[PDB]
Symmetry: D2
Subunit: 284 residues, 4 copies
């Protein structure tokens, strides 16, 4: 199972042909699970879920999708509210692959796309696993913007290597995870003209009149499926206090908190994360 063995592409229509890059594994398995990645600079499905895909492939039919703007997926230079924009694309891909009701596993930005999909097409989404997710999260104590949001903005404005490193350092509890190779790899992926076009579009998307579609904490009370919320106690991007509204309003919600863990739950606690997801999703 490698980057290349599992690669796949598809074309879907969101206001015009939209290419989605993805990964696929565990092809003989009965149950299909879609993984949606978080959203830093140079982020993608594979670097996000490499400690997870192989483990999840033993039980599930795994589809880890680069979200428009990321990975090898169209970096259009214009889009609306991002989570909606990405759910629409995901809807297209479901329809194509002929997926029915699937369970979604997304962290951070991915979790917001997950939840947005789930509200917009209720019948198509099953159980949710959400790791330090945006959208449905609202920090009741932490002044916004947070440290992690600020460090990302700083990089969006001045995309230096020093700025990227500062950002990656608040991604994790154990800062030893931030190596030279990691910073170099993300910086290269992130400093392309295409990726910066994507970065510009996301930036402009915030002023759109549709901002309310990002405020999912107002809406998750409508969710009917079981939802597993997963947070690192030391998340500095989407802090723990932002889990409360969701935990309170979602009827069949569950919360699991890991001490000594930051924003990258699926990396820093990859083993417990894996087991937790597999078990919550019924073991396949």
């Amino acid at each position: 199972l490698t980057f290349e063995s599992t690669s796949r592409f598809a074309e879907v229509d969101v206001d015009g042909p939209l290419k989605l890059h993805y990964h696929e594994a565990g092809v003989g398995n009965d149950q299909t699970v879609v993984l949606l990645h978080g959203g830093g600079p140079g982020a993608a499905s594979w670097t996000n879920f490499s400690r997870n895909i192989a483990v999840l492939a033993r039980h599930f039919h795994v589809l880890a999708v680069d979200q428009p703007g990321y990975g090898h997926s169209d970096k259009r230079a214009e889009h609306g509210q991002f989570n909606r924009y990405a759910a629409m694309a995901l809807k297209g891909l479901f329809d194509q692959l002929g997926l029915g009701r699937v369970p979604l596993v997304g962290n951070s930005l991915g979790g917001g796309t997950a939840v947005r999909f789930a509200l917009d097409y209720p019948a198509r989404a099953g159980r949710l696993v959400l790791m330090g997710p945006g959208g449905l999260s609202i920090n009741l104590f932490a002044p916004d913007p947070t440290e992690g949001v600020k460090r990302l903005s700083k990089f969006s404005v001045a995309p230096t290597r020093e700025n990227l490193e500062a950002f990656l350092r608040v991604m994790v509890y154990d800062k030893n995870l931030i190596t030279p190779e990691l910073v170099d790899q993300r910086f290269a992926l992130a400093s392309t003209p295409e990726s910066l076009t994507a970065t510009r579009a996301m930036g402009k998307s915030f002023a759109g009149a549709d901002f309310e579609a990002g405020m999912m904490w107002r809406e998750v009370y409508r969710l009917r499926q079981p939802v597993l919320l997963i947070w690192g106690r030391e998340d500095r991007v989407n802090p723990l206090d932002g889990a409360l509204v969701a935990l309170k309003t979602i009827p069949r919600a569950q919360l699991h908190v890991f001490g000594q863990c930051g924003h990258w739950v699926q990396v820093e606690k990859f083993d417990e994360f894996n087991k937790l997801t597999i078990e919550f999703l019924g073991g396949g």
Copy 2:
């Protein structure tokens, strides 16, 4: 595996011979786990952990101990701070059975005894699983006393069947669990002259000069082992806001919250509870 097959007794010394009733199962298993029960009227090891012991016996060497004052254990009429009182007894039993460092699984009152043991004899306690526990819990939002504490006091003052039922009803999310047979069984166990002597002692123990030993939320920052905190989102005795200090101060803490679940986690979510404990305790 029945009440009677698993019964066992021992005599230990806490300021004089103290008899402890207990249960034992999975006797050929390598790892030993001690279960400590919650503390209502007429509560004991077996009625507390009947949906759990057999499942846990497949993996672990299980010891579910009636805490002095409960079950078939000495109902002295005088004691100090209860958690300390019960840890001392547990220390005696460990020493006797020759247990070394063991993992403790206790809910409510049991969790407080668990934590108190763990602070008082560091070397003897391993991983902790704590369900809606007293002691280390401190409700930052809920006015004290809570609904559940009030309903217990009411029964302590006027031990009627109507009072007991009212208490049991705030024990759970699904109130259908409170049946006629359950109320009758607890009321009979609880209305004996011995049990009321125990109830009187607990009551007097609160005025003791040692009250500070019940305030474990001040102390859990000293815990070094992994701790799994488990709460029902609808706990009306020890509410969710009382988990925050513990989650924050214990270095290797984890929190899992179940929506649609009250104070009796091991009953209302017995299946998920079981798997969670087994996995956290290393599968044996």
Copy 3:
């Protein structure tokens, strides 16, 4: 000052004709302040702000409105979501008196009504002072229904004097405020047939399909004016954890919390509440 001196009346149109009774004072003064009372059984504008109306009249033009269903206003037998129903009546009173943009003061149901008016009729509302308010509260930690809400529900089903007293005691921190006179007085008011019809018309408006209008926590981020939230630390009806989302989302919010104070701030801490309200509004 007194009831009949201040007493006054109006007749507006909410899906028909609606009699609102109010109380007027400080007609000399330069700034108009609307008061809105709490929604307990047998509650009305005058007995609610009895310790507040005089003091405020020395600074402002006071209008203490009896909300539909209470006091001497029309107690109809059905209505929709109550706050919006009470905001429609008040908007009606507004245009009838050529009121401009006015500050609003309201505890409990009154607070919910105020917020809802402030959201429905934006040009018409200014500085708001909400004491333990409904609607815009969402108890992030407290299991619903809360203990105070259950007592009220208990009284609607069974409107005895005992059930009312049980409710009134859960209302305050210092229980000596609950004098037998007080109970007699509210219970006299509450047990008329017209009162119980409002009590029943209300309790089934909960089931409307416009329930969402009561979930104001979802909306207050749109509020533009300074809002001051006051809460009693020991409020067992709308607990302190209910204030969080609003403190967070209302741009110009402020929170004051009184320890040793329950659900009736304007009563249990009348002085501090008065002085604080007078200053927040502008000395007038």
Copy 4:
């Protein structure tokens, strides 16, 4: 009023001789109030309460003390836990001036010092006003070290003008408070050798074995006097979640929260803070 007019000095004994510098005003007035300043780099009693000392002097006998390490008091090269070290110096100033039981006002480090004195010298303290205070705070949701605490740490390691400005900006909500004059002034003060020795003596007292004396959250339940906590909703140094345990455990506590206010309450909301402080203390 001014520096040298109010200026004053003393010489007490903390494990030797200790020069404390203070500021006196309102000697006419009947009630004595101690002020204790914040602990930023180059901070001192006068510049801290510059917008507060005059107004308070029209009501009380004001004593604004420079804490050991700050302003014109002895900046020694080592000490133990700092609050307790500062409370010992102040108790010394107390007996030297035949002070009785006095109210104490202190933000940040000052608040921590005040609380600690109030716990060490119980007979000597009265009503307390703490603005975003240290020690007695514990951030239940915010990962430590916070963002403001990191900037400070950053300056100690590298005391440039840029690092100081970065710190001062994280101090306030309205950044226009951070004038280049202001930076120049603090940086002039902070970069002397005697200042940096205090800055370094402090930063290594953290490692003492008396660290526990700084964990005041563990103790405040013992406080008997009325305490008013004031906090800025957007405080990025000691965030709002830090106020919870104290609001909960201090019997006669009160909390006021300002939106659009950071870590310097006495500055960003000087008027409200003054009026609120004057009233809480008794008009004097």
